Design a protein around this nucleic acid. Structure first.
Length: 229
DNA sequence: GCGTCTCGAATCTGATGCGTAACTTGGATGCTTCGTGCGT
């Protein structure tokens, strides 16, 4: 029930995707086993795994953050930080990279009270045939709480955490919209919504995630530091 | 109707004398007859 969060203070605030590319280039030199383990690539290939990715990325005020879900992903992050830190030190000799490790406890429990949660960035579209289902909010809303519940169940199963069988998550409203871009060469921008708020009948602990393509660092939110309503 | 980091470490971890003295130290008894009085 442990999710290991590691913060790298590059000195300059870093993009998620740019950080992913930079570390992938840096990892490419070092032992390939750790490389393929880190970016969830099958040994010998470069394919994204069907199963819930456990090691992912994320932004920070002065760098990028490592989020290793589950016991296995936490262990991978724990024995991978020294090598990536050494690589970062080698790559930037003009700045001092500093690392602090925060090992969190992950748990989720149900309460009769309705708990309101906010997510900064949301992605709800992958393919145009799926966007045909997203053509209007009438079909969009069901897809929304469906995605939230599916993501919660997926991460609970991946970390082996029992989840309240009587959950009812309800999307509340929207504030802003953005665009999600998978690769620099890709012209397609996926759907993106900012200031998303939803109601859930459970007290969420640790850090949870929702959206698509966990391996970049979008759609993340810390339930612990967000308090509640 | 919030949490991580922290969540010790290194000694020391006995030493010395005193660590018996004096007496007591066994005793006694395991025969039957003969003569002279003394109680039934």
């Amino acid at each position: 029930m442990f999710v290991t969060q590691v913060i790298f203070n590059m000195g300059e605030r870093a993009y998620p995707d740019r950080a992913r590319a930079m570390v992938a280039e840096l990892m490419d030199g070092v032992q390939p086993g750790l490389v393929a383990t880190l970016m969830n690539y099958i040994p010998g290939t470069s394919t994204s795994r069907t199963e819930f990715p456990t090691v992912q990325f994320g932004g920070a005020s002065d760098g990028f953050c490592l989020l290793g879900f589950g016991d296995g992903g936490g262990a991978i992050v724990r024995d991978a930080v020294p090598l990536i830190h050494a690589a970062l030190a080698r790559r930037m000799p003009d700045r001092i990279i500093q690392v602090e490790h925060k090992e969190h406890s992950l748990s989720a429990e149900a309460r009769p009270y309705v708990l309101s949660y906010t997510v900064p960035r949301m992605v709800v579209q992958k393919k145009q045939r799926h966007a045909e289902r997203l053509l209007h909010e009438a079909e969009g809303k069901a897809h929304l709480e469906g995605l939230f519940l599916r993501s919660l169940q997926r991460q609970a199963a991946a970390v082996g955490l029992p989840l309240p069988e009587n959950l009812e998550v309800e999307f509340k409203g929207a504030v802003g919209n953005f665009a999600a871009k998978h690769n620099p060469n890709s012209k397609v921008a996926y759907r993106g919504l900012r200031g998303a708020v939803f109601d859930v009948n459970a007290r969420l602990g640790g850090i949870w995630t929702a959206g698509f393509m966990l391996s970049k660092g979008y759609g993340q939110f810390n339930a612990t530091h967000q308090l509640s309503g």
